[PDB]
Write a protein that holds these residues in place. Structure first.
Motif, short mmCIF file in Angstrom:
data_model
loop_
_atom_site.label_atom_id
_atom_site.label_comp_id
_atom_site.label_asym_id
_atom_site.label_seq_id
_atom_site.Cartn_x
_atom_site.Cartn_y
_atom_site.Cartn_z
N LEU A 163 37.06 31.49 -0.47
CA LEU A 163 37.05 30.56 -1.49
C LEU A 163 35.60 30.28 -1.77
N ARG A 164 34.73 30.46 -0.71
CA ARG A 164 33.20 30.28 -0.83
C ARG A 164 32.89 31.63 -1.72
N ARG A 165 33.24 32.61 -1.24
CA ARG A 165 32.73 33.86 -2.04
C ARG A 165 33.18 34.08 -3.36
N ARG A 166 34.28 33.62 -3.80
CA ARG A 166 34.80 33.24 -5.15
C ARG A 166 33.76 32.34 -5.89
N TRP A 167 33.63 31.17 -5.30
CA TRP A 167 32.90 30.15 -5.88
C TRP A 167 31.28 30.53 -6.15
N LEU A 168 30.94 31.48 -5.09
CA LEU A 168 29.49 32.18 -5.48
C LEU A 168 29.62 33.00 -6.53
N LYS A 169 30.50 33.86 -6.55
CA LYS A 169 31.00 34.81 -7.56
C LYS A 169 30.88 34.09 -9.08
N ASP A 170 31.50 32.98 -9.13
CA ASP A 170 31.61 32.06 -10.39
C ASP A 170 30.37 31.52 -10.99
N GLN A 171 29.32 31.51 -9.94
CA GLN A 171 28.07 30.82 -10.40
C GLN A 171 26.97 31.85 -11.27
N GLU A 172 27.48 33.08 -11.40
CA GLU A 172 26.67 34.07 -12.10
C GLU A 172 26.64 33.69 -13.72
#
Lengths: 70, 37
Positions: free
Chosen positions: B17-26
């Motif tokens: 979930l953290r990696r998906r959230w960090l990807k969505d910050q692009e």
């Protein structure tokens, strides 16, 4: 490449207040500065002179600047 | 010793979930949509 969104608080309202403050200060600041410049250049200040004999001045004839006399 | 299996599972799911959230910050290539100044 690799641009990230930067989370920051809403800076819209603070900038709006600063713009409103600047506009409403300048709205009378600019005409007053222009008027003071035009008073100083064209009307000008008074010149010190001795009182003529038998003549009494008005109470506003003891000041130099036109605005202070007014 | 290492993690428990429950600790491992929770860490795995939280990391996903953290990696998906960090990807969505692009940022999208069209962002920021600057107004015509």
């Amino acid at each position: 490449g690799k641009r990230l969104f930067i989370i920051k608080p809403s800076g819209f309202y603070d900038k709006r207040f600063l713009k409103l403050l600047r506009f409403y200060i300048l709205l009378t600041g600019i005409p007053v500065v222009i008027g003071i410049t035009l008073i100083n250049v064209f009307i000008g200040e008074a010149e010190l002179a001795e009182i003529p004999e038998g003549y009494v001045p008005e109470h506003w004839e003891y000041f130099k600047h036109p605005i202070s006399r007014w | 010793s290492g993690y428990t299996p429950d600790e491992k599972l929770r860490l795995q799911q939280l990391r996903e979930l953290r990696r998906r959230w960090l990807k969505d910050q692009e940022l999208s290539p069209r962002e920021p949509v600057l107004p015509p100044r």
